[PDB]
């Protein structure tokens, strides 16, 4: 391990150099560029400062202590260096949490409003984060959980001092931010796919001829049934995916009610033959229920969306649910299950939301849909059309910034995943897990987390076009001089 000592010194030498130069460039680039001068990027400046703190005083002492093979400085120099390392690591994960919340609210704001998301309170949330990070690192001085570790030649937070302090540090300052951020970028990725998936040039009301009342009367006549509140279902027949079984059980509940005579049902799909029989059974017993097992054209489905009054989406698990959004394009008021994706698309103003897997509540939701006059429906169709219109509005946008900030988080998660995992293993039995954990695994977990501090500016340049432009802009301005001929 003689060479392993010099190699460890190189990793830090690289980190210190790239951090000091790189994160200083990030601070300048945001102030210099008008494109990067937005309020939502105050967190980026705050995260870069957190990265700079460790390369100025803690890391340099750790670098000497590799060569010295011990702590040749005081106890205050150990307690303070461990403290600034805390504010940095804890500050970095909460700043990344801030950006993840900021960017999720940004897509939601651009959907509901024509004006861009201002990020007006960005400076206040940064100060709140630093008051939170200080409140978590500060009690480690009095408890005495900060001490030198010879293996990693540094003064850090010892995971073997108090297991209660480590479990709280792993849950509240790693597992808690991780969940918040993974959920945020999950909801962003769905909304970007919904923007991608919609086609306002195909699913357009223009393609339809006469009035909705005339087109509904025409569609119902061809199916052999008179005028009424027409409901539609479209999707494969399955016991626990698209929930055709929930709809079928609900029609039976409604068949006895005097309100059923004023209803019309057009079920479309194919799957489980038992469900296919159940549907055809009600088609016989009731003349207001029509089943289509055949595959209908995208052109005809578009005409159906434009003619029917409602579209029932009783799906158990629907992640995107473009069908709900496609129906809204042609004024079909959706009645859908409160599932992830459908919860995003359907507003309380646009459609009716119901609990997934309940035929009772769906029957009452279909009843609520029936207890609505021609005047009430016309505004609901308008809102449905306006909501689908806002999704296509975001199509020309450059979603490249969301990828960079996601890569920033992804890399942070890789660097600190072993350190927080070892911290849980050590928390089980501190006396037993000290030799049970391999030395290479302990050293690698710590130095990965150290290298992370210089990673963020390298990522900004290789992915964000505006950052790469301003890096060369500042570099050339200080290299080249001014002279007169
Ligand atoms: C919890 O507070 C601190 C205070 C100082 C630190 C200094 C260096 C590194 C860490 C993270 C090590 N925590 C885990 C759970 O692995 C610190 C954490």
Swiss-Prot record:
GO terms for biological process: adenylate cyclase-inhibiting G protein-coupled receptor signaling pathway; circadian rhythm; G protein-coupled receptor signaling pathway; G protein-coupled receptor signaling pathway, coupled to cyclic nucleotide second messenger; mating behavior. Disulfide bonds join 78-155. It is found in: Cell membrane. Keywords: Cell membrane, Disulfide bond, G-protein coupled receptor, Glycoprotein, Membrane, Receptor, Transducer, Transmembrane, Transmembrane helix. Changing residue 32 to W: Exhibits significantly reduced B(max) and slightly enhanced affinity. One of its GO terms (cellular component) is receptor complex. The keyword Disulfide bond applies. This is Melatonin receptor type 1A. The gene is MTNR1A.
């Amino acid at each position: 391990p003689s060479w392993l000592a010099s190699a460890l010194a190189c990793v830090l030498i690289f980190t210190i150099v790239v951090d000091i130069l790189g994160n200083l460039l990030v601070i300048l680039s945001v102030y210099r560029n008008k494109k990067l001068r937005n309020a939502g990027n105050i967190f980026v400046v705050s995260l870069a400062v957190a990265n700079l703190v460790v390369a100025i005083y803690p890391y340099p002492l750790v670098l000497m202590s590799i060569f010295n093979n011990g702590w040749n400085f005081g106890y205050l120099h150990c307690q303070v260096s461990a403290f600034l390392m805390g504010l940095s690591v804890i500050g970095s994960i909460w700043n990344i949490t801030g950006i993840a919340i900021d960017r999720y609210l940004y897509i939601c704001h651009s959907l509901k409003y024509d004006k861009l998301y201002s990020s007006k309170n960005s400076l206040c949330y940064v100060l709140l984060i630093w008051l939170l990070t200080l409140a978590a690192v500060l009690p480690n001085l009095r408890a005495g959980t900060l001490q030198y570790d010879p293996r990693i030649y540094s003064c850090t937070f010892a995971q073997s001092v108090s297991s209660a302090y480590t479990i709280a540090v792993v849950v509240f300052h790693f597992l808690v931010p991780m969940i918040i951020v993974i959920f945020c970028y999950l909801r962003i990725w769905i909304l970007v796919l919904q923007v991608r998936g919609i086609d306002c040039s195909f699913w357009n009301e223009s393609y339809l001829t006469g009035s909705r009342d005339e087109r509904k009367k025409s569609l119902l006549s061809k199916f052999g049934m008179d005028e009424g509140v027409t409901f539609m279902f479209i999707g494969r027949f399955d016991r626990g995916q698209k929930g055709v079984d929930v709809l079928l059980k609900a029609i039976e509940i409604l068949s006895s009610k005097k309100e059923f005579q004023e209803m019309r049902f057009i079920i479309i799909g194919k799957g489980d033959p038992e469900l296919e029989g159940w549907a055809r059974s009600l088609e016989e017993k009731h003349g207001n229920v029509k089943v289509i097992t055949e595959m209908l054209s995208r052109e005809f489905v578009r005409e159906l969306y434009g003619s029917v009054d409602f579209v029932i989406i009783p799906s158990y698990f629907e992640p995107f649910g473009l069908v709900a959004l496609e129906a809204m394009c042609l004024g079909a008021i959706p009645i859908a299950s409160a599932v992830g994706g459908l919860r995003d698309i359907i507003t309380n103003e646009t459609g009716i939301l119901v609990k997934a897997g309940d035929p009772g509540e769906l029957a009452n939701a279909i009843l609520k849909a029936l207890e609505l006059s021609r005047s009430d429906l016309s505004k609901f169709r308008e809102n449905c059309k306006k909501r689908a219109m806002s999704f296509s509005k975001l199509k020309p946008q450059d979603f490249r910034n969301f990828v960079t900030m996601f890569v920033v988080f992804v890399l942070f998660a890789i660097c600190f995943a072993p350190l927080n995992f070892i911290g849980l293993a050590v928390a089980s039995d501190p006396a037993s897990m000290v030799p049970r954990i391999p030395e290479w695994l302990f050293v690698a977990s710590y130095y990965m987390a150290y290298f992370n501090s210089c990673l963020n500016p390298i990522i900004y340049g290789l992915l964000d076009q505006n950052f790469r432009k301003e890096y060369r802009r500042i570099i050339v301005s200080l290299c080249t001089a001014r002279v007169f001929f």
